From a paper:
In this study, we characterized two members of a newly identified LarA subfamily that lacks one of the catalytic histidine residues conserved in other LarAHs.
Like LarABw, LarASp also assembles as an octamer that is a tetrameric dimer, and the monomeric protein has a putative active site between the N- and C-domains. Arg431 (equivalent to Arg434 in LarABw) forms multiple hydrogen bonds with the same set of residues from the other protomer as in LarABw at the dimerization interface, suggesting that the tail-to-tail dimer is common in this LarA subfamily whereas octamerization may not be so prevalent since the residues at the interface between the neighboring dimers are not conserved. At the active site, a continuous density matches the NPN cofactor. Like in LarALp and LarAIp, the nickel atom in the NPN cofactor is coordinated to the C4 atom of the pyridinium ring, two sulfur atoms, and the imidazole side chain of His211 in a square-planar coordination.
Author numbering:
A (entry chain H), B (entry chain A), C (entry chain B), D (entry chain E): 2 to 481
Amino acid sequence: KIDFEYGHGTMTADLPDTTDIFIPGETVADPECLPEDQIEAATLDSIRNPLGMPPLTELAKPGSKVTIVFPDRVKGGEQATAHRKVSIKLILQELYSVGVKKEDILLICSNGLHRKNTEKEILGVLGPDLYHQFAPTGQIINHDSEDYEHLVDLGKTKQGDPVIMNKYVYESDVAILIGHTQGNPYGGYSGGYKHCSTGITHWKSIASHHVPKVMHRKDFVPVNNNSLMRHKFDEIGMHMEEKMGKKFFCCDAVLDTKSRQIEINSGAADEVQKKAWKLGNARTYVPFAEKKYDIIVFGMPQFFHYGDGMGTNPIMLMQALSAQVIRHKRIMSDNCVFICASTCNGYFNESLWPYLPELYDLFQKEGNTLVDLNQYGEYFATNEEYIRKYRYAHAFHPFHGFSMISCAHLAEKHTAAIYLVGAEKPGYARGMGLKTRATFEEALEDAKKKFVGQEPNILALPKAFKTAAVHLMMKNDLPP
Amino acid sequence: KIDFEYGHGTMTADLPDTTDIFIPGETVADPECLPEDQIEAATLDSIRNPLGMPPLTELAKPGSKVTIVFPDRVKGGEQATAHRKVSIKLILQELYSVGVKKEDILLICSNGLHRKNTEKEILGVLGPDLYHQFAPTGQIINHDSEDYEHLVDLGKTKQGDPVIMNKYVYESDVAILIGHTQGNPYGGYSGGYKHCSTGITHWKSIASHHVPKVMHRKDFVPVNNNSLMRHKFDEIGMHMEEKMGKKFFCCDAVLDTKSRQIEINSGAADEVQKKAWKLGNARTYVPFAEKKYDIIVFGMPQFFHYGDGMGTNPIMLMQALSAQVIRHKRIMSDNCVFICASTCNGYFNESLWPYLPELYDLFQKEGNTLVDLNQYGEYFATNEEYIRKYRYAHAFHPFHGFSMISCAHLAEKHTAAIYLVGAEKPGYARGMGLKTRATFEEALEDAKKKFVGQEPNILALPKAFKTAAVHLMMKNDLPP
Amino acid sequence: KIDFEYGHGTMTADLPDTTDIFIPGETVADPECLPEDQIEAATLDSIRNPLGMPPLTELAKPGSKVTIVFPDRVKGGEQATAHRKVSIKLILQELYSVGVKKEDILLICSNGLHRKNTEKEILGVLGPDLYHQFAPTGQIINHDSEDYEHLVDLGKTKQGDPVIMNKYVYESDVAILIGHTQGNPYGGYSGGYKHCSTGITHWKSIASHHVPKVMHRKDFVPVNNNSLMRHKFDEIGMHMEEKMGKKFFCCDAVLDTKSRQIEINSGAADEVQKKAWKLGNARTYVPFAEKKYDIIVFGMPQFFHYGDGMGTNPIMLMQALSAQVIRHKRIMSDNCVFICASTCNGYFNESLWPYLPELYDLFQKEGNTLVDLNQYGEYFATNEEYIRKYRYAHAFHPFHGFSMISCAHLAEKHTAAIYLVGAEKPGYARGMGLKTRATFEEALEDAKKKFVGQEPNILALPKAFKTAAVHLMMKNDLPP
Amino acid sequence: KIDFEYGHGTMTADLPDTTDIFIPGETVADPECLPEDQIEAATLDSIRNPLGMPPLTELAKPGSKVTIVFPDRVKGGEQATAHRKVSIKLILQELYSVGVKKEDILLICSNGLHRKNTEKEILGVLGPDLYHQFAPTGQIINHDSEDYEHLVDLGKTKQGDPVIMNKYVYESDVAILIGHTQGNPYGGYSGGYKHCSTGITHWKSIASHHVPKVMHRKDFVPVNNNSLMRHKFDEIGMHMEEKMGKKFFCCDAVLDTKSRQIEINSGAADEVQKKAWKLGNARTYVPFAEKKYDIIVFGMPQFFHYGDGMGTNPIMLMQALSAQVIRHKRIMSDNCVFICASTCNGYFNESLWPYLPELYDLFQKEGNTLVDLNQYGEYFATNEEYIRKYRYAHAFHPFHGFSMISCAHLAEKHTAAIYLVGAEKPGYARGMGLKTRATFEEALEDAKKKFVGQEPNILALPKAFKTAAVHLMMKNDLPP
Ligand SMILES: *C(=S)c1cc(C(=O)S)c[n+]([C@@H]2O[C@H](COP(=O)(O)O)[C@@H](O)[C@H]2O)c1
Ligand SMILES: *C(=S)c1cc(C(=O)S)c[n+]([C@@H]2O[C@H](COP(=O)(O)O)[C@@H](O)[C@H]2O)c1
Ligand SMILES: *C(=S)c1cc(C(=O)S)c[n+]([C@@H]2O[C@H](COP(=O)(O)O)[C@@H](O)[C@H]2O)c1
Ligand SMILES: *C(=S)c1cc(C(=O)S)c[n+]([C@@H]2O[C@H](COP(=O)(O)O)[C@@H](O)[C@H]2O)c1
Ligand code: NI
Ligand code: NI
Ligand code: NI
Ligand code: NI
């Protein structure tokens, strides 16, 4: 009896007593996070002694325009001592010390193609103090990847990747990036060059890497720190750095499963990435599996990663399954079977993803596999209604969904079969290529009969999505 | 490089040179069909010398009411020397020899839950001679399982099985069942007791055996001559014989893969079944395979079996896949993979199956598997509009579709995965639980990577639905 | 420059000066119609001296139930001296002369499958005298072919023809059929045995002869007095006479092109038909053409024959074209081309023919030719909503439309091509299989280029539908 | 017994034994294709020895911008030694030899109003080597006739033809057109000035000749080499040539039925056309017919020419019929009949042609003939949704459909009747003015009865659309 996430709660699975249960942070201890009394001091020390650039004192002159670009509510923590709040607070104190005016500081939420964070979401992300400091003056803005008035086209990179970036960050004298060095199937880790290359860029810039051309090759599944997606992240980052004539001050903190800071690294994006990747690999790449697992059992809540309906939207849940594939491919056998509890009730969450019903209909009409949809990316990404919903209705940018399906296809690709149990509308899961069973037990027996045999190595991931999911490797494997 | 049925033509698969190809009737020779000149003599000898039941001349008095119940266009063949035409002509000659009035003979098409054969279809089935002999007088009637003015309820059997049969057959004094002892996933063979128990019955009688409670038991896959399905067929047949006060004259011919008569058997249904079962097993239960087959590759044409759209309608498509499962389970590995070519263009053929769009939508809304739909059988079977379309619009009876899903779930249950290639609308195939690939090669590589390994035993089945399919067994297997 | 019917008016065709113009009743003189002064005297003499049946005075006992079945507004005259009004008035006077009670007389409008005539239409048909004499007491009833409470099933005929007739006519003691001997594509002439067999029967009785099985044989085009259609008419008529125990008093008047009486024939239906055949052939079978006509040019008004939309509804449009084919087949060349003006504006007249939009949609969905629709006849004929609209909303009976398409296919079958000119919505005409051109000149040039050559024999038929059409034959042809 | 294309396969026709069967390349031997070992050498010799201009070495300076404009997947073949792949490879080698940088070379797919080729289609067209060489850097772009950022308006010609052309080709120092001098009803042949005038121009430029005002005159049907369409092609080509100050280097190869190279010619467009014209006339204009054919029998596959649904979309199907008309006018009698097998199942392929459902509805509700639609061309061509689907959803440009109907009208104009055989939804074929018959035999008998007589000259074209269809002439006719 193992409880797995099911929509809003838990559904029980009668898994065998030999099933291995892994919970991030719990089953294998993450690197010890900084104590609460020490988190602020560590962040201040990181800011005051950066890597690859002089501190914010030398970079910022009195009266200089400063853009502090912080990540949205998808990643990071919202506690009183969260990395975003503490880091932005001490960075603002440092800026005020050197004479940088408060009215000349812009807090930019790096949603990128994700939904623009609402006022309450921004308040929760930044904390009451920072929000009430900057929101009344309009000094907290969500990045708009479709507001070309506040976007600068920087041309293409040496590899042909277009670069359109946030105008406030472009014209600012000091661009600071609050980042979380958390485990991410997209490029290995969040923050660093990924933060700038995605959260404050265009869908066209993101289309260079968030496509099957780079995330359906060998280097993406399982993810590493030197995949093509991360390479394009770095390329776009340094391209914008050359275009502005300045480099991003990347205040990035490695976070544990509970989004608590383990270490904080500030300075140059590449220096910060290199310095933080050691602890990021100690926390994210967990050598836990003693044997390859034939069945991976987990549960999908309705609201884990990108908001409500993330575990009920067929495309969003397929992308979550694919993210699990990228995370645990190192411990997955060739014929691995995913058994996921999801309330696939047809709740697409059109408020969050208005384009996803039409993307799903396009997949049903044309696509044998989700990769067949990639040709329509721009078609959604230039859709005026979806663009308007992203810009004003706090919806995800349309092209994000293609990134989603660009990830989601790996779920169909790298698993023998994926079982979705408890689907209230199993037709949507089947339309995403998932086998549908009413309960965990029937899917378990079906997988044993068809793909994995009567004595499979079953891995249970009860908190696969409600927690910061680590990427599992073999016990003898070393963190890449 | 093997062509497989695909819509109205063929799709070519670049299968490995080690792929074994089986064409029913060509790869393994059928029992030698009777010559065209000898067919009439053999049928006349069988009719004049029936088994375990008095000859037709000894059953019908002058002025007797005779019902010749012939099968519909789905099986039997429509050649000049087809069993239906020749057998009915000789039987009518014998009846006129004992002075049976022509006006007292009714030709009943035993569609059962299948669509009432149109006048053109009846003409093609019976030959111009028989048609223009009996059609202008209105003596050829399609059996109506929903015309209760022409239905007689015989009550429950000894096992509580509801029997409602055609009123013309019940009230006649001589009922002559024209039958084809041909390979059939339902009950082993066609004709005999199955002919009466299905073709001239109510949907409630079919619900007794076409329920998953009888189709999904361990004795149905692969189908044999002693399955529960045939048991209910026989029970309903002898219930008819007891309530009617007369015995069916089962003029049955064993047919090869080209619908040519090999031997004609007349007399009581039980005796005809016992005598013709040996040659039926010789023709159908073919001991061909020397090894278990990991991949079974075939193609689905748009038109086959029940009519147009059978290879495109998702539910009929799954029923055809499950029929293949039933027929070839003896040569299948536990992780067997189906790779079928089907256009799957969303052509439900509402004229043939108007209830099937609603059934598919119900499957998507509620059903994890197709068995979840069975509780709605009566709901479709009593649907007024679908009943009207079956009675007058020459549509299939609604409950027949449930029989299909009752069969079709087996395709999901037994195969590890079924690949559909060439799907114009892959969404319907995926909503049936099928993996969708654009071409045969992609599905083959996917099956090799996921289920069967890089060196699978691949069986090619070209014309698997164009010709009368056989039940493939291992070389050392004995015919049931 | 000849004006042809077009919607509510005329369209001019710049036909060659060699075009022959035929106007029924004008180009060839009709038999001299009875002048208004002696019309009453002739009708009274015919009624008092019937043919092969006793006079009405010798048939109706005092206080006996009498049903006067008069035809609807589709055919016959509506003037003061119209056959229906005068004949019914004189018959009622004769009945009152022998003491037959006024209350015991029922005036039945024999619509059959045609729309029940409204109270206004019944008044116009019967005259104010007869209407206000019998309407206020409810003694004028439209025949309801779907009011089984007022229908009597007489069973199949000797030819297997189902007969269900009006209950009032069946249960009456004297049934008097008012009839018009006029040019009719159905059965040669109207009235007589056709009157009873169609105007007061069930749709099942009409289905015996109004299907392609009877309308599309070689003996129907051109139509005569010895076609199979007339044979079924006679068989159903004598079946009605035999089951009733009484003989129809067929008070029939031969009508010219202006619906004026030429001679009145009363008595048995067979004897009346024999007596009136000569003058019916003289009026209808006109030997006018001295050569075969390659192009037949006529115009279709919006209102004619069955009512509004007849020239605009695609199916009634094809039925009118096929009626023209049937009437003018004797003068038609093998490759004859019809060029018809019609406002094919998509006005289906759902009030008149609610089943016809569905019938046309079915034809587009699966009908290569209109005969492909015949299998659905009962499906429309048993449709509850269409039956309700026929019974209460004064709509045509659904199966009547099938009769129309049963006729209408002839237009497709016999003409090389039919050109519709002036169609506001040419798509409906094309979906009926008609070539569409904007003007008469374009269609004429197209027909000359494609089928008939640059010097065709063009026949102009203005008012081909406004006047009672004739069956044109060659000058040397004899009248059947 | 001749098999003609039907949907995804073939259907059989019981044509008379006197029916003449023509297959391009097979029935009449095409000019001998260049051997595979000699194709590359001949292409290199052609590029190194151009006509009308100096070679690419003398035209391209080191660092000069070069646009290699290649045709889409519709024609040209995709074999390993196809003209596009080999020609582009050797041309790139020559450019690298003279010092032209790889980053300064743009591979432009000249889709024109045709759908932008997807990444997979571009890969298949160009070969894996060329694709992976230029695709990752974004150096392969589809021509966008609606991206005015990358379009240059060159004004009108001397005849008022608007000229808007691809901006990359305009600003490039060397424009190299890869061309296929294969049979084409549009202007006689592809490549040369047609390639530039259509594949990299605006819909407004194409509207000068793709309207009925140009392709419905005497010269277009039958197509010749001096038709007005080719004249306007030449005019637009030289207009763009003078506008850029450079002339197109037309590397054009003549192709056989199997798209294999027969002769490769490079240099100026007019000189290339003149040189390749003899081979193009030898391969394309085949003097095969000994007598004019009253019936031409062929069949449409679902996929051919412009993609999926070409044989099922009613407008696309009718345009294919018209292309056959233009191809075989020289061997076609005045009362010619087309009998084409097509699965006219209503599959419009909205993905390929989203505007064609609404264009078809416009034809049904307004158009007597297809020319009546031409006034709405710009209305579709400026439709924002259809433009977006062409630009991003890989759909055909809207105005292309009008070109299609501009061709398609000839099918109605130059044939007495066209019989569409086996239509699943015959209403669409009838709405395109085509006679619909269920089987080949029905259409054959109908055509014999109506248009061509009982002993017609029947031509069979079993591979009319699955191969590069030649234009047939009389055996005494010289190639124009
Ligand atoms: C990672 S792929 C990523 C992608 C996007 C897109 O728009 S696609 C946006 N972001 C934003 O960058 C911040 C932190 O990155 P993380 O990897 O999501 O944790 C955050 O604001 C993201 O929304 C990231
Ligand atoms: C087989 S299970 C079967 C089922 C039905 C139903 O209605 S369910 C009807 N029939 C008819 O019986 C005839 C011959 O049987 P066959 O197995 O189809 O060959 C024939 O008329 C069937 O339609 C059979
Ligand atoms: C002629 S076929 C016919 C058919 C019908 C049908 O219902 S179908 C009905 N009637 C009616 O009989 C009366 C006179 O016949 P006529 O040929 O129409 O003049 C008249 O009331 C008809 O409506 C006739
Ligand atoms: C021929 S008329 C033609 C028309 C167009 C239009 O947009 S209309 C486009 N093209 C493209 O030019 C290339 C080769 O020409 P072909 O005649 O098709 O072989 C090719 O890319 C065409 O798509 C041609
Ligand atoms: Ni992203
Ligand atoms: Ni059955
Ligand atoms: Ni009638
Ligand atoms: Ni073109």
